[PDB]
């Protein structure tokens, strides 16, 4: 779904940068891409070299990934991205998911995370409220972070407005190119 | 020996604390045993960063040696009393980032001090948390779990922890980090 420019690229700036460490390279699934949040987030991780890994609802949507260059387009109203991911890596998985999926997509997607893997959570506590995390599932340093920006904006305005300023920089100077 | 073990503690707290666990000034970081090696370092890094420290030991005289290094608080690593303490002393707030090392019970009433946004940071073998699980519901607030194995993670990625491991001494060799004894 949409999103203002600022709330999608806040999310997904702090999302694939801070939390998620993604570098050069590295493996990066992008659930929901053509929405606001996962647009900012195909667009970061054009800047930052990784290769880019992503699912969409309709043929339409998933027409207009496979038109951005990316590695694999999968669709987000299922669970087969993940063994479609296991086949084209070999069993290696990926490095970061960006996840707004509900339900076995968020097993599913621990479960297909590399090794140093960061799975980042978006979906509201509604989302996972009931579910449990099995922690041997996290035990190759792998990690589970929730991002609420929401909240984060609360608690931390001045942060966020520095940041804000940090990415449009980016902008500015020809780094980031927001697709 | 040496050499290597102060690298590997060295490591383990900087990764885990700058790389992971992003901590920044002021915010409150929970050292368990941190007379250890991993814990000192972690102590000598939270003071070079300005950090609020909340430690635990587990005899009286280890406790007695952190309290002198000046920390907010010192606990019992034996018990899990750390959670309703530290509770009480931050007027309810938890801490911001929580480097774990204690086994059993300590996990999930560390993960449930986390403030929002809160990190916790696990660093045992996986035969500690082997069957244990988590709500997820606890990480609501943007929180987050991460395990870190610097033993694999040093056998997956040897080239980035030896330029991580001479960036820290570089650090150290220049007096912008003061190793604690
Ligand atoms: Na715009
Ligand atoms: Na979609
Ligand atoms: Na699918
Ligand atoms: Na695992
Ligand atoms: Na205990
Ligand atoms: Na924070
Ligand atoms: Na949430």
Redesign the pocket.
């Known amino acids: 779904e949409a999103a203002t420019f600022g709330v999608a690229y806040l999310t997904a700036w702090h999302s694939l940068c801070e939390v998620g460490r993604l570098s050069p390279g590295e493996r990066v699934l992008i659930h929901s891409a053509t929405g606001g949040v996962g647009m900012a987030a195909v667009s970061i991780a054009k800047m930052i070299g990784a290769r880019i890994y992503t699912?969409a609802g309709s043929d339409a949507k998933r027409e207009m990934l496979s038109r951005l260059g990316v590695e694999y387009v999968?669709?987000?109203?299922?669970?087969?991205?993940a063994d479609?991911i296991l086949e084209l890596t070999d069993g290696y998985g990926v490095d970061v998911v960006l996840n707004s999926l509900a339900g076995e997509a968020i097993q599913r997607g621990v479960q297909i995370l590399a090794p140093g893997g960061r799975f980042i959570e978006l979906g509201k506590k509604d989302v996972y409220a009931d579910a449990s995390l099995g922690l041997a599932a996290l035990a190759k340093s792998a990690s589970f972070s929730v991002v609420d920006l929401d909240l984060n904006l609360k608690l931390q305005p001045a942060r966020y407005r520095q940041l804000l300023q940090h990415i449009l920089q980016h902008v500015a100077d020809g780094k980031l190119e927001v697709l």
């Not at 999968?74 to 991205?81: A, C, P, T």
């Open positions: 699912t999968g669709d987000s109203r299922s669970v087969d991205f479609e």
